[PDB]
Amino acid sequence: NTKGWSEVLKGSECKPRPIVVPVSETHPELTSQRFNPPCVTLMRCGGCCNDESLECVPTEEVNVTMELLGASGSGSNGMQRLSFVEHKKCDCRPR
Amino acid sequence: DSNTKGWSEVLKGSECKPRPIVVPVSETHPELTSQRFNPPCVTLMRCGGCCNDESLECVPTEEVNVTMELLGGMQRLSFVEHKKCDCRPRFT
Ligand SMILES: *[C@@H]1O[C@H](CO)[C@@H](O)[C@H](O)[C@H]1NC(C)=O
Ligand SMILES: [Cl-]
């Protein structure tokens, strides 16, 4: 059935939301290597602000460590614990 | 550290599966862009994640309509959501 307006609004608000991001882009300094999985889900600020002059931006972040399959010291396949920025709070702030 | 995601959780979060994504209303219904909506966007379930093999793409294998109320008075707009996904050979 139909989603009511309150539910629709709550689903479009500026808040942290999961987003799939390429791991290489989160760690550009780890060059000449591949990551498995090559993508991760990170909590990032997302949604719509009620005004064209506002953007949905983080007001609180956190670092989280994820174990991925990447490269070892020899460039072989090996596990890597890497750190990622997640957003914990967000706000509609002027540009 | 209490905030450490392990191998399995990492793999699970990478899956080709339906994921919530924010979509602007004006780029879904291009027949009503002469109007602003409150809210100006919606969350739709859409397929994403990444496949084991670069020659495959994460595509929807099941699709359903969802209706939502939005302020113009109040209007019902219909959207397509993805309920199932699969990695399929890339289309040429
Ligand atoms: C994450 O840790 C780094 C230390 O390198 C720090 O600079 C950053 O502010 C931390 N994030 C928060 C807000 O916890
Ligand atoms: Cl793709």
UniProtKB/Swiss-Prot annotation, chain B:
Disulfide bonds: 16-58, 47-85, 51-87
One function term, GO molecular function aspect: growth factor activity
Assigned GO CC terms: extracellular space; membrane
Residues glycosylated per entry: 65
Subcellular localization: Secreted
Main subcellular location: secreted
One Gene Ontology term from the biological process aspect of the record: response to hypoxia
Similarity-based family: Belongs to the PDGF/VEGF growth factor family.
Function: Induces endothelial proliferation.
Subunit structure: Homodimer; disulfide-linked.
Protein's name according to its UniProt entry: Vascular endothelial growth factor homolog
Organism name: Orf virus (strain NZ2) (OV NZ-2)
